[PDB]
Symmetry: C5
Subunit: 394 residues, 5 copies
């Protein structure tokens, strides 16, 4: 009975186009806040952040006021979209096809005219995502809210601290914070401020998943490529081992491609690491070909250069701590024996070439081991957030 | 004739903004229940549960009452969306872009004013999905429903047991249950309860599919990696076998990647199993390289260390139960015979090195077999739901 | 002039909320039929059938009647959505986010009040898809239609045979039929029937595509795995051939994964066939390792067991139809000759071990050939729809 | 001033439900045409054509006429959707979830009452796509337009030639033409025609992309499989080469799968070509195994059959244009010499078996080369649109 | 109070169908501009450009004017969609399913009647994307805006320079510019211009990403294919190396396929480069087979042709700077010695054939190296935007 009377009375002559101030010259203060419930996606290709957010607006409607003594029991009223004035606060940097992502809920008012509007939404905002340090990258995404058409002398936008009590932690992104700031922009024409409220979402990429799917597989496959330098040449499998390791890295690249960013503004950190690892596997195959050249050197070819015999068989090999009828029968038998002696000399020459091959495998083992470790440590620790990341995620 | 008169009479002065109670001070009891028809998806990346659900609301409208004697034949009426008051019960933790997923069906009322509202919908709710024990994981997803704007003294929300008679069993998830609970939240300002109804969907992952696509392939490929230790070195195919098995696991990883979860909150169980299996295949290739080093050992190199000949050729080899002119012609022929004797001594030394290689293959066969079995059994049975899962799904 | 007058007259006092019967106690008969134009998708993961369907409803509106003599030329009228009463027939088991998939076309009425409503739509219905016999599976998907709120004493739903004259044959599914049935459900409270009309779409999976992309490739790759038993051991390529065939099957699995169903309610038929084929390829690699063990057996090792020489060299090998100074020079020359004789004896022993290896390759060739044929024939012909399928599709 | 007066005057008593004819017995002629701007997609799995099309409708509204002398300056008026009568022409075979894909633009009318309606849209129509001759296939997709509810005596649909001046050429489909035809369907009840306008889009698949991604790669990989017959057996790499070529074709199949059609109504042309090529690569591996059997034939095994020595070493090999103390020392030395002579005889036998292997490689080289060329030429030129396609696209 | 009075006064007798000019014969000038915020996607398959754009329209409404002295404090008013007249400017070449992508914001008017309309939107326009020079391609995409129904004598469209102050740089596309142009089209019927405003977006593809994912991997894998010519034939791994490199390129093609364009209007630049590289790897395998033919040439076969011994062993080999009882014992021993001499002659012949094989590997090394460099440099530098691209992106 009383709310029937009240609802009839409140909408008599009410115009939802009218900003509800007693004095049209005075501004209408609107309190704007938000509540972040979820980070949904960070699209680095489309440069868009998707978030679950409940916006919180509050103001005072001069017309929706009543004496609670004349309508006992009726402390609040609800108005659906389009029936009363609402602040036209929109996300300026919206990247949604609808532009307005909010679900228009009812406006709750109490007897004194204080209106509360709690529109939920799944927002999509344009955010520049810098993947230079991927996967140890920290992103700062702005959410800029403001009145589409009212200036600061008509709509006095005020900010309140964002609520994160209901935030559901993301599995891929760590929320550093959601700080907010009120700013005013001025047009050179006029002296009216134009206010906006910007919330800067700072979020850190969790790196455990990437540690086990990109960093480790690349270290361990790189190690198996170094194993070629320990395989004896007589096996006849050095090329098989090395070339098949390279193939495994190509097949690996397929898995890596689904999670690596596709940009041309910079070479990500992990792209420098993956490329580095594959040049070292490629160069190990190249060094293996040279080693086989030495091992299979034809004994009747070119005599071991003097420099080859010094730089390898002496210096490097030390540093590495390696180390009538009767007369006719005589002629026939002297030929057989001399043939065998020539074979022995040829085999001795081949043994020197084979030992040189061994020495080059140990030099390359040592050099490639050092070079892989230096690149791995240097590339990963060049990230400013490496230490913090590993400490928090591992 | 009579329903024409009745429909005209029921909407005279009716305001769909008005909560329909005779006393505005008294609360309006709303009975809320749901009916779960289908679990559609459990998105562990976006942390969203999609379900097919028919909500069931009931209340009493003080204004929609008529004497069935004055309108014979007219026992019920139907009102479409927006024509009469409805409870504003919404899914609080909705993750839908529309926020409100319900299809607004007609409200059925009978002569005494009892209204039944059966809105169907495909709901998307935010649910934290813990994949620590994947694929033997049990998930608990909450569905929290409540009035958007009414407090407990105006809208007295009451719960009824969820209906699962129409539930269609899912092929991927086993429905443990859908228990419900009514709760009240209080603001420190005031003494009015704010009620909500939460339905907790508990669902168990069926593991048969994962048993045949991840667990078994990994066991059987791991077994083929152990086969390198049985392959004789003279084949010249040990590295080929072992390295190609590793490649097959990389290609396998591709299939596994489509179904494995991508999170950084924990290493899933199956990720520990897959990683474990691949370190053992990688280490078998490493051990094979060492074995080939022994088998192709140069006979004129370093004499078998004393420790090598004891730790291997004696202890391990026992535990494994293995085991003028005439004088000139004399000189020419004595050289030929002595050359052959030197060859025999060299070949005998090589045979010892080759037998040592055999012994290391049996040690590694035994050790790697034990270590694969222990890791497989230990990793899979570390799941609290392993026994139950295997009993129900296999 | 006349239709202007008529349209004005027909909507005077008309209420689209009113069921249009002269007697509110009498039921309003609605004739319901459908027309199936296309099967669009059979989602076995989401358990949803998508179909192109034109629904056909007919009833009689007591109020939309006119004398065609008083409005010459005006034989029919059209009313858009919301202007006149319509039956609230909905798909009960709808799996669409909109729930109502129909496009609301105009209601055509003639002078006697007979209304025809032909709403088109792309419907999504929840259908349990049993993939036990994939790809020789027949599916039965129900389409249950009924009034959302009217009981059988108010809305007398009647069925007519579904129209399939306009059906466009699907490339993946063969339409067996679309039989319909009217049923009544009773509540224990009351004696009013609640009718519904269910159309059961029976559709058979066409198997030609699967015959050329899964069945054949698996037979032919399985055959190439058997070819290892024909490759002589001296090639040094048995392991290479066998292990690379297994890899090709893993790469094949990738193609197969895109079209195989992902369920845990049963192991599909094709999953049993693919698994079977890969265990036999895996076991051929295992048998090859054993064969190489025999072929490279060290001649100075363990004497061929007595049982080995009988079970293989005799029985299986028969069944398979296989089969001063002068004296010093004497000593030097007698050693050379005796060394050669020892070599010949050692080589003879090795030849027996090599022939045993040959015999095991023929046994395994024969056994594996038989076992592959039996599994292929047995697994595929275990499908109840195998004969029919092959006869209609090949 | 004048258009204000005119707009007020034109909608006085206007009913948008009324077909706007002075005589309700006379039909209202509607001129229907379309303008094709783009072919967007040809979905052969879902059997749907997506096109960008601007429909063009024209008619005469008897009520929207005014004297341009009484409203100077007002030559035309615009009416938005729902304000005036429009023809209910819809795409009959629409495959869109909205069914009606048009964007409802304003209706332009001039002083004489001639209305022009230019609704744009992205249309989805159901088209049977026959991929028997893929990628040399020509498709004919119908677009059938008609009034949903009006018969030919009320709405006289007339056709005009489709406009293709604004057509943007597609990169995948060549537009042969868009011919249109007006037809009338009769119901046996009645003598009123029911007209429709059907536009048949004929489009030819461009084949350049498929020439470089499917046809060529398959020819060149097939050639590399033939290279096994030129590789000498002593390399020990024939199986490696052949088996790795087969693997490369499996990996190739992956790329081919993304662009090949998935149907069971026929085996496409390119599926016959790809299958053919892979049976020939598979059979080359089989023939290689036989060749190795000959090359490694044990010299102490079965004597070259008489037929083998004739069919190969003579006929095929011609067609291919190939081609006390002292006495003791005598005994010791006579054994050494006789041992060597036996070795020479054994080696001579082996040389015959090795030459037979060479002859079989040349026969197979020649035969497989011929058979690959015949299948390639025969399969591709069996397409009725092959010559035209290659001439226009290459 | 004053804005309530004003809003009531402004909509008295206002018709949003009326073009708001004091003189219906005079045109209404509309100022049209846009603001480009983001390039979202360049779909070269669907030929569609997606952009984030805020349109800017301005005009003068003759009816929305008021004296600011009679309504103090009320300087501006806002009107939502449908309440006042708006220009019907649409994107002519829209490729959106909605056709109209704008979000209809409020129209801001001031006391003098100047209306500002700032509709945001995510636009999809049809743009022909020429990928002939991919990835060094520059695209020109037009955005054509105009009134749907008004001619130039009723709606005088005027252009203003596009605003790019808020443009967010894209990671894949470099914005060269957004120049605009006003044009008039005439119908031969009449002398009224029909104006439109076209904005031509010129954008350059950034090539850093493609440099590291397509250009480099193809160079480095091509280099590893050249390494076969340095591998000695005795290794028995030349075919293994070469054939596995080809496989790695096939697996590589998979990654390349996701980013390469699929068109039949031309062969892109990168498709010519990738094809070129793979023909050279294929031909290296072919040349390797020929080399092995020489190396394993049977010594008792065909004598080195005279031309072979000149073209290779002399010219090319120079250019490349390469280079009673007693008598019985005599007979037995003379046979042994002569057997060895025959072996030496046979081995000498084989050495010539093996040296010829070496010479062919160096010729092919040199020739293939030159041919790879020429094709790489020639194909990439044939792009008109190569120099500029590399200078700006690397
Ligand atoms: C058509 C396809 C090919 C079909 C068949 C294989 C062709 C090779 C075998 C026949 C040729 C001769 C031969 O080698 O015979 C062998 C025996 O022969 C058998 O007993 C084997 C027959 C069954 C083969 C099963 C595997 C299918 C091959 C996979 C198909 C993959 C297809 C993939 C296509 C995409 C051995 O030769 P032999 O000289 O007889 O024995 C020595 C006798 N001795 C010891 C007594 C002296
Ligand atoms: N996606 S996953 O389940 O996290 C997954 C699956 C397999 C796998 C890993 C992760 C990595 C984590 C540890 C081993 C490492 C990788 C690997 C690479 C080379 C060698 Br040698 C051995 C092992 N194996």
């Amino acid at each position: 009975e009383f709310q029937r009377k009240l609802y009839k009375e409140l909408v008599k002559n009410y115009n939802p186009l009218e900003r509800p101030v007693a004095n049209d010259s005075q501004p209408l203060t609107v309190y704007f806040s938000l509540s972040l419930l979820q980070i949904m996606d960070v699209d680095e290709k489309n440069q868009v952040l998707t978030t679950n957010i409940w916006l919180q607006m509050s103001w005072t409607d001069h017309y929706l006021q009543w004496n609670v003594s004349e309508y006992p029991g009726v402390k609040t009223v609800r108005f659906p979209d389009g029936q009363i004035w609402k602040p036209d606060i929109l996300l300026y940097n919206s990247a949604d096809e609808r532009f307005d992502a909010t679900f228009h809920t009812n406006v709750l008012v109490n007897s004194s005219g204080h209106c509360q509007y709690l529109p939920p939404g799944i927002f999509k905002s344009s955010c520049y995502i810098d993947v230079r340090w991927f996967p140890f990258d920290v992103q700062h995404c702005k959410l800029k809210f403001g009145s589409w058409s009212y200036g600061g002398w008509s709509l006095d936008l005020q900010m309140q601290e964002a609520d994160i009590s209901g935030y559901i932690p993301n599995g891929e992104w760590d929320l550093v914070g959601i700080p907010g700031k009120r700013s005013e922009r001025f047009y050179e024409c006029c002296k009216e401020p134009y206010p906006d409220v910007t919330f800067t979402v700072t979020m850190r990429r969790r790196t455990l998943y990437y540690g086990l799917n990109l960093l480790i597989p690349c270290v361990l496959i790189s190690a198996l490529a170094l194993l070629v330098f320990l395989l004896p040449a007589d096996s006849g499998e050095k090329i098989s081992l090395g070339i098949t390791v390279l193939l495994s890295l190509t097949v690996f690249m397929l898995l890596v491609a689904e999670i690596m960013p596709a940009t041309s503004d910079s070479v990500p950190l992990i792209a420098q690491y993956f490329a580095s690892t594959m040049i070292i596997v490629g160069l190990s195959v190249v060094v293996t070909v040279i080693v086989l050249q030495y091992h299979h050197h034809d004994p009747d070819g070119g005599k071991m250069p003097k420099w080859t015999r010094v730089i390898l068989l002496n210096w490097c090999a030390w540093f590495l701590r390696m180390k009538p009828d009767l007369a006719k029968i005589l002629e026939e038998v002297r030929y057989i024996a001399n043939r065998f002696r020539c074979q022995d000399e040829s085999e001795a020459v081949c043994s020197e070439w084979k030992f040189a091959a061994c020495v080059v495998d140990r030099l390359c083992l040592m050099a490639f081991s050092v070079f892989t470790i230096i690149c791995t440590i240097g590339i990963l620790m060049s990230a400013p957030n490496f230490v913090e990341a590993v400490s928090k995620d591992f």
